Swiss-Prot record, chain C:
Function: Binds the lower part of the 30S subunit head. Binds mRNA in the 70S ribosome, positioning it for translation.
Residue span, KH type-2 domain: 38-106
Protein's name according to its UniProt entry: Small ribosomal subunit protein uS3
GO biological process: translation
Assembly mode: Part of the 30S ribosomal subunit. Forms a tight complex with proteins S10 and S14.
Source taxonomy: Bacteria, Thermotogati, Deinococcota, Deinococci, Thermales
Keywords: Ribonucleoprotein, Ribosomal protein, RNA-binding, rRNA-binding
Keyword Ribonucleoprotein on entry: yes
Species the sequence originates in: Thermus thermophilus (strain ATCC 27634 / DSM 579 / HB8)
SMART domains recorded: KH
Curated annotation (Swiss-Prot), chain D:
Gene3D superfamilies given in the database record: 30s Ribosomal Protein S14, Chain N
PROSITE patterns hit by this protein: RIBOSOMAL_S14
Protein's recorded name: Small ribosomal subunit protein uS14
SUPFAM superfamilies assigned: Glucocorticoid receptor-like (DNA-binding domain)
UniProt GO molecular function: rRNA binding; structural constituent of ribosome; zinc ion binding
Biological source species: Thermus thermophilus (strain ATCC 27634 / DSM 579 / HB8)
UniProtKB/Swiss-Prot annotation, chain F:
InterPro entries on file: Ribosomal_uS10, Ribosomal_uS10_CS, Ribosomal_uS10_dom, Ribosomal_uS10_dom_sf
Protein name from the UniProt record: Small ribosomal subunit protein uS10
Quaternary context: Part of the 30S ribosomal subunit. Forms a tight complex with proteins S3 and S14. Also contacts protein S9.
GO-annotated biological processes: translation
Keyword Transmembrane included in the entry's annotation: no
HAMAP family according to UniProt: Ribosomal_uS10 (MF_00508)
UniProt record similarity statement: Belongs to the universal ribosomal protein uS10 family.
GO function terms (MF aspect): rRNA binding; structural constituent of ribosome; tRNA binding
Cross-referenced Gene3D superfamilies: Ribosomal protein S10 domain (3.30.70.600)
Taxonomic superkingdom: Bacteria
CC terms in the record's Gene Ontology section: ribonucleoprotein complex; ribosome
Swiss-Prot record, chain G:
Record keywords: Ribonucleoprotein, Ribosomal protein, RNA-binding, rRNA-binding, tRNA-binding
HAMAP family (UniProt xref): Ribosomal_uS13 (MF_01315)
Entry's Gene Ontology cellular component terms: cytosol; small ribosomal subunit
Protein name: Small ribosomal subunit protein uS13
Residue span of region Disordered: 94-118
KW Ribonucleoprotein (keyword) present: yes
One biological process term in Gene Ontology: translation
Family: Belongs to the universal ribosomal protein uS13 family.
UniProt subunit comment: Part of the 30S ribosomal subunit. Forms a loose heterodimer with protein S19. Forms two bridges to the 50S subunit in the 70S ribosome, contacting protein L5 and the 23S rRNA; these bridges are straddled by the 5S rRNA.
NCBIfam families found in the cross-reference section: uS13_bact
SUPFAM superfamilies reported for this sequence: S13-like H2TH domain
UniProt GO molecular function: rRNA binding; structural constituent of ribosome; tRNA binding
Keyword match tRNA-binding: yes
Amino acid sequence: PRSLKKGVFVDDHLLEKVLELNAKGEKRLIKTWSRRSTIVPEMVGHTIAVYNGKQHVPVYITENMVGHKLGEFAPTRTYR
Amino acid sequence: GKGDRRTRRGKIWRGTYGKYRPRK
Amino acid sequence: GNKIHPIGFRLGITRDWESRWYAGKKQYRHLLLEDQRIRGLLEKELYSAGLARVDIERAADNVAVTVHVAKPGVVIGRGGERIRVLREELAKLTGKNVALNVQEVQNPNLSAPLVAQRVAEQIERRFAVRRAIKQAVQRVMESGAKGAKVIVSGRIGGAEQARTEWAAQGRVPLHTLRANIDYGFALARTTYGVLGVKAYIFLGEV
Amino acid sequence: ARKALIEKAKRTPKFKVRAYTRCVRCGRARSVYRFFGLCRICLRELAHKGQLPGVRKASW
Amino acid sequence: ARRRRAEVRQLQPDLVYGDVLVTAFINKIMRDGKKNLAARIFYDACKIIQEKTGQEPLKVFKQAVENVKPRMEVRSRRVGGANYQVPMEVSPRRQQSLALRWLVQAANQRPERRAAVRIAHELMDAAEGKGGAVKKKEDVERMAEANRAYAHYRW
Amino acid sequence: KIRIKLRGFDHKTLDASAQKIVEAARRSGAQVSGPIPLPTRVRRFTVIRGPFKHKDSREHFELRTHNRLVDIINPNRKTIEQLMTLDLPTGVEIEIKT
Amino acid sequence: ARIAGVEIPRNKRVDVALTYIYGIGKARAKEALEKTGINPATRVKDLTEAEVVRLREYVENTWKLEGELRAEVAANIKRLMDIGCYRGLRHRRGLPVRGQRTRTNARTRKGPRKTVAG
Amino acid sequence: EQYYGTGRRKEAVARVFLRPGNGKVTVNGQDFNEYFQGLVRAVAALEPLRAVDALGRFDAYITVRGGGKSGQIDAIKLGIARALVQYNPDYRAKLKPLGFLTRDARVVERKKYGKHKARRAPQYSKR
RNA sequence: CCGGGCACUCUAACGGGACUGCCCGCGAAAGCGGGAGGAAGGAGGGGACGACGUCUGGUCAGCAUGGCCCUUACGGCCUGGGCGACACACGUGCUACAAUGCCCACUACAAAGCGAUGCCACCCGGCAACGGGGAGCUAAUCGCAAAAAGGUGGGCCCAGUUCGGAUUGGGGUCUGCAACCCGACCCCAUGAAGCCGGAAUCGCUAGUAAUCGCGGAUCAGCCAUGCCGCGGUGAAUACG
Ligand SMILES: [Zn+2]
């Protein structure tokens, strides 16, 4: 079960910081405290930095890792 | 039984409108 | 942990509302904040004379108001000196034809609300704690009155251990749902910590 | 009713879904009855006299 | 009952025969309060007790219950460091209730896959000397006349 | 035939402050649609009588909005100037719409 | 009557029966007697011969059931794994997955009360 | 010709128009035995009339609307009992000693606070 | 629905009515068993109401005020995260464990409430959430919305089952900038535990307990089965 409706959401303020990055090659990592944004295709290899709540961690995202949102990778708690 | 869902008595207790429960 | 407001268990009977009007959904929800400004304003200063009970009877746009005072003379001035200064500045935030009316408060010693501030005052003027209290009932019981009461509190006389003095006299049919009983609570800031007395006042009967 | 938190008087959030009612007199943040703008607290001791007409010790 | 000896819900007979027990009975059969199907069950219980037999279920529910209705039982009091089961009879109304109720109990602790049956069918083996109820009755009753060794506490 | 909405907080005042709104003008044209009651809609509410904790209590408060109307039947013009914009109603409310 | 791979509904109302197939609940239970038209109120222990077929024919060639399915899901969740999705966590931990607490009743997806002290 | 005798109970209103005749009775629309599925109940609702026996002497039309059937059947119970005193206001040689004329005030209890239902008090543990 | 019409419920405004006043009994009296009449009685039912004080009960975290204590900051703006972890233990509940039951269809009675950015009759796409188009209501006279238990018929036949719906895979609508952590709602699939609960233990004396369903509250939506109310149906039993 998923949900977004008619018109997918993605914070339109990290995109310019992306469709531009691979618009002339690539980069080495992006930094934006936004996980509310969907993961999209070209974001391949980009390697983003989504927040945790303190620390910051990598995301060598891929297509299979698309239908999923950026935040679907921010491990908050800490079990065991 | 209530909380069952997909059945009249599901959209009774919970009270909703889906398929199993239309508008006559 | 028991007993509630005296006028409260009355309102609908023997003691009308302050803002005694009527509104509706798209209204009221501010016809009260603004009606409480009839308080914060037409009472923030009269105190030194009345502050009795500013019940309003507005009726669409227009407003009847009424701001009672036991000292009808400190409300006016030179035939109407202070019945302006802010009497219009009463509208300097809410004009809406909101006026002003005052009446003859017959005996401040039959208006505990005052009697309280009275104590409060005498509680600030450091007056003898209980005495002015036993005087309270008197002054009051004297004014044709019936019952009384004065229930100060907290570290009386600036004392340490927080206590709460008594004092009142003949007839306090609080439970009686039909006595013209009055209330009126006074606070009184404090160089050692706030106090505040209640002061009740039974009156008439039916 | 903490002014550093009563600024909501902005009704100028950034995203409409952010106006936290607040009591008109008590301030707090919750229980803040919409019809009377204030709180559930006040309301009681309040209406108890007349700052709230139409009211009445709801018996029955 | 620190005061009144109670006014006892003094009900009424019934649309059928015209004798109290029914409504009472039914009430027992009744559940969650729907006297409806309740009533039904007691009426249709007469349906097979007039389909598998002819004898008007009038005296059945009668001559039957009068067998379930005990006439003894126990109630212990901790006099001296112990709870002694004292033997003693019963009152009308109770002896009755017990009787009446006992049915619907052992009336459902049955096999018959149908309600009205369980009911009806019970009433059958009721007036017989082999009734689910009459067992408990006998069972509980027989408890006494056995512990008769203590009826000196008589009461 | 006219129509007058006599709704409000009070009970027999909305009655009074519109009980004088009767014969005043039924003396030149015709009668009246009568002083009609109408089901009152009340608004209850309740809340923890205490400022912290304490189930059981919360205290009750109503607020009954009463209704009334009247309406003067066959009020042939001049049969209306009899009780024109003349009244007393204060914390009471009434409106017209025929 | 043998339908779906490793599947045999029997003696029970058909509309019912079928439910006995992995990819089938009382829902597709009718959408099956639809395009098949096969009388609904009957017994598998009574189906004709051109009837039983029309089902197997339809049911088998129309969906994705049994092993073939039970394995798509396993390989499907096995998916949430590999990557770094929150979901994999709840599976790689065998705990709730769609937004629940764990301080309490989380036993259905957790397993038998493994008590210690506290 | 015609009489009356309202009669209400529980919380159901019932107009009870009775006149001479046999036993052709009705209710809110359909006749009586029609809008009340021969429920063991109803039968008694009309028992009042059967005071000093009759039925086949008087008749009626009762639009008892309000509440629910149990109450309905009962509201009637009064009219067709208060109805035989508009005609025979002396029909109580065995009418009052029946009481099918005593509006029972058995009503419902309001949900008090704390509890769950005017009386139904919630579970508390360890004391 | 159109006239017409207040005698019918009804609506909210007032008044009336019940006081052991009437007779028998025992009585010193109060007054208790017990009848007449009365729609009702001996306080007819339920409420709002909680004494002098008790525990030093509760929160300075709603507010207020008598100090320890802050100030480049334990004061202030914001974003994300947290309050929703999980080996576990308890409290209070929801839903069950089914046949006096469950599922479908036809049809039908409640009362108190709620609706202008708001409640939504109808028509249409749609299995559907829901989006579009659209009558009137300023709300006894429109509508939320329909109630549900019940009733007539028929499907099921004692089966972990058409009982029961936890978990889970996928698709999708809605509110929102935004729902991964962390949202409800529809549909398909999956269909788990439970076959009535050890010791112990909670509520309730009548329209009460049990049960069914309706409403609002704060609120964008909402994790609400919880809270405050409404009636439908309507018991058991009290020796002491
Ligand atoms: Zn407040």
